[PDB]
Amino acid sequence: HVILEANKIRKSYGNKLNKQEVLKGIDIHIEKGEFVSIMGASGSGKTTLLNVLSSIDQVSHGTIHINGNDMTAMKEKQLAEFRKQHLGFIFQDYNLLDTLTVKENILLPLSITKLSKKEANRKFEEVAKELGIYELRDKYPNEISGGQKQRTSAGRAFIHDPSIIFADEPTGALDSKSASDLLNKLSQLNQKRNATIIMVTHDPVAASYCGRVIFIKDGQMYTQLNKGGQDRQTFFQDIMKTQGVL
């Protein structure tokens, strides 16, 4: 429970003469298995929060605890091992190796675990069938559509079965149809295997698929919403109006 926890995390940039503080007292209690999101205007300290929560950066003051462990008092080797074992990543821009086909490019993170090839084979088989990109196994990533490349990047983050998945805004390069399809498949993968996808977006209809929208203004959270039993449309209305309030 509460697979992610934070207490008064604070971060400031600049040195000596120039100093700015963009994170001022953030307290988050994201719960296991919830397709949580973060919403707010650009330049309000979103990607900095994502970096801090993932131990990519370091805190000026604050403690973040995941699965009973602590993050602020560990060394680089064990931090990297934990990042491998209990984390999965997606970012706005796809990062695919054009030297390899989609097949081994997806299978790369699982090819170094000293495992039989057949297990990885049907693991990729299941992942591709769920993501519906099975047919392009033997094609280079220089001859496929952008949405397919993005879904390949997303499926890379799911093969090694991470306990907690992070993401940046994943619909900044896709089309409307492809964005809707990708969000639908992410929602479907939410409840098949229990993974806490923590998106970070600034788009209302993008966050309409979530269920724990949490706002932010300039470095301090404001509100909190829940899906309840709404049908993905009245929730969009409520979210977008409460955005218009600010």
């Binding site: 990062n95 030297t99 390899l100 170094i112």
Partner: protein, 635 residues
């Protein structure tokens, strides 16, 4: 999949930008193998000199290995810098630092050993012209043959394996200091530093000018000046390269009231904020280049001043000491049938005084004032110079002795005998020595007097050390017709070679100075090329570090001609400053160095400077081309 397949594809589709890397490796390997196989070849000993011949090459290799190692270390950046986003992505996926290091090291080993294998074959192809040049310099012509000398290959393999073992550490450090990534005004102290550097450089040059101008004419007034000049010049150039260019650029930068266009912004900002970045390297390059040029000039002067020095040591055409051996030579030259003008010229050690002929300080007294072992001769042997009574003329120039021992221009020669004194005046001039160097020790100028004075001095018979034989046995030869045969007969008669010869002694100096000149020239050329290339590498790196200011400034629509004009000006300044500094240091280092020796030459300096300019011009043009290529693919 298999990581080996990944490495193979990475190498296959990455081996298109790594050409300068392979070329530099090939060049280094070829030069080192050529030098080492020149060493371990058994035909080198055909030279004849005091040194072992193969002894110097060990020290030369010791000096060369550091240079080639530094060159390869500064070339490794080309391979290592581009791998940043790949390392960040590999860390993002999960693979740790050690796996990334091993993956990169596999390709590094493949490229390195391929280039090393190619380099050995290329060096053996050229490892005969170097030997031909060496034989041409020392003038010993027997043959020229091509041999492999496996020991040279073993030494090259060991040295370059060690160098790669050293490179691995730099690779590991660069991989270490990487993360996930995203896959200043002027204080008043700088004014003082710049002014201080400029003033020390100026005063060092000035005090160097006074030294060989004629001052400091005493032994204890020379070492202090040497050490002070060396230290002042080194510290002055270091301060010049770390604060005297920013100071001298700020004046022009502030002269225009904050209003610049593209050319001035590029040139001035780049120079002002980048020259200060690296300061230790430029000092090393300039100082070492000046020292090498000066040393080569000294070696050339010493080599070319061989015939005259040999003629000075060898008083006659051929020299003898043993009277029995002289009589034997007289017997066996009858079959030679050569006009011999052998004279039993008698010389006595008659003492005079030159203490009163000191034009400097009275404290220079020089051993015995009036009981020296000076040599005198009568007028029957030498008739060329006509000197009246009460006059004398010194015979000798002695540059190595002139650097310290200087006679007064009008110093009357007060001959401090036991009772008498003969004042002497300087009218004529002569340089004909009638004695060999073995009897003059440090070198006493020849003195010619009348027969009556010679008789009086010899009948005085002062109890002073006397030469073993008085009448020097030295023979002259007729017109040059039978030189070589005379040389081999004289060589075969003095099987113990306790005697002295002209055509034999006039070759050891030439051989020794030829070896010195060869070593100095080879090392200097190698270092000069390497130093010229390092700046090109630095400029390529700085070009790669300044692309977003070309992505912008082109969307605003500045085309490419303006940018390339600015780059041409920047490269002109950046390659012109160190060149001029090195030229001035070299000119004031070579100048001091024939004053100690004899007359000026002016012959090789022009050639060395024009080569110096040409290579830097070539490197600057290549840097401009690289900058153009980088700018073109920006937007």
């Amino acid at each position: 999949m298999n990581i080996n397949q990944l490495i193979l594809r990475n190498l296959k589709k990455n081996l298109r930008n790594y050409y300068l890397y392979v070329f530099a490796l090939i060049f280094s390997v070829a030069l080192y193998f050529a030098f080492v196989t020149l060493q371990y070849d058994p035909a080198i000993n055909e030279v004849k000199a005091s040194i072992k011949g193969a002894a110097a090459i060990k020290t030369a290799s010791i000096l060369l290995v550091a240079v080639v190692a530094i060159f390869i270390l500064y070339a490794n950046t080309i391979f290592i810098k581009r791998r940043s986003k790949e390392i960040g992505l590999f860390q993002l996926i999960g693979m740790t630092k050690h796996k990334i290091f091993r993956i990169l090291s596999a390709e590094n080993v493949m490229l390195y050993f391929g280039s090393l294998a190619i380099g050995v074959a290329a060096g053996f192809s050229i490892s005969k012209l170097v030997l031909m040049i060496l034989f041409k310099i020392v003038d010993v012509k027997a043959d020229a043959k091509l041999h492999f000398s496996e020991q040279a290959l073993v030494q090259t393999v060991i040295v370059f394996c060690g160098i790669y073992l050293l490179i691995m550490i730099m690779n590991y450090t660069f991989i270490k200091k990487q993360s996930i990534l995203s896959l200043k005004k002027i204080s008043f102290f700088q004014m003082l530093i710049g002014a201080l550097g400029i003033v020390l450089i100026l005063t060092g040059y000035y005090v160097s000018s006074e030294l060989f101008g004629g001052k400091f004419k005493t032994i204890n007034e020379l070492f202090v000046a040497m050490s002070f000049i060396l230290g002042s010049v080194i510290i002055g150039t270091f301060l010049f390269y770390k604060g005297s260019v920013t100071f001298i650029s700020n004046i022009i930068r502030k002269s225009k009231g904050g209003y610049l266009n593209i050319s001035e912004v590029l040139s001035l900002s780049s120079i002002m904020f980048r020259m200060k970045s690296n300061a230790l390297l430029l000092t090393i390059i300039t100082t070492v280049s000046a020292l090498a040029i000066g040393l080569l000039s000294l070696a050339y002067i010493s080599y070319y001043s061989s015939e005259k020095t040999a003629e000075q040591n060898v008083a006659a055409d051929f020299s003898f000491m043993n009277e029995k051996d002289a009589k034997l030579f007289e017997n066996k030259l009858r079959e030679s049938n050569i006009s011999f003008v052998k004279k039993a010229t008698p010389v006595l050690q008659a003492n005079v005084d030159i203490a009163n002929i000191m034009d400097g300080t009275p404290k220079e007294m020089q051993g015995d004032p009036g009981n020296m072992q000076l040599a005198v001769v009568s007028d029957k042997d030498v008739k060329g110079v006509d000197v009246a009574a009460g006059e004398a003329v010194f015979s000798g120039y002695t540059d190595l002795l002139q650097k310290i021992m200087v006679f007064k221009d009008s110093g009357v020669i007060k001959v401090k005998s036991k009772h008498e004194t003969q004042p002497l005046k300087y009218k004529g001039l002569r340089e004909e020595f009638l004695v060999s160097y073995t009897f003059t020790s440090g070198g006493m100028p020849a003195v010619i007097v009348d027969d009556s004075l010679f008789k009086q001095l010899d009948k005085d018979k002062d109890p002073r050390i006397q030469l073993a034989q008085s009448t020097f046995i030295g023979v002259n030869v007729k017109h040059d017709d039978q030189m070589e045969k005379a040389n081999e007969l004289f060589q075969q008669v003095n099987k113990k070679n306790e005697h002295l010869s002209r055509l034999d002694t006039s070759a050891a100096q030439k051989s020794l100075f030829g070896m010195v000149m060869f070593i100095v020239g080879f090392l200097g050329l190698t270092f000069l090329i390497t130093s010229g290339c390092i700046l090109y590498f630095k400029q390529m790196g700085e070009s790669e570090d300044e692309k977003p200011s070309y992505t912008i400034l082109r969307k605003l629509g500045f085309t490419q001609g303006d940018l390339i004009k600015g780059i041409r000006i920047k490269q002109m300044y950046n390659f012109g400053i160190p060149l001029v500094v090195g030229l001035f240091h070299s000119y004031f280092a070579v100048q001091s160095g024939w004053f100690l020796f004899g007359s000026e030459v002016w012959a090789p300096m022009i050639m060395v400077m024009v080569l110096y300019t040409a290579l830097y011009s070539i490197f600057g043009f290549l840097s401009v081309l690289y900058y153009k290529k980088v700018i073109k693919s920006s937007l």
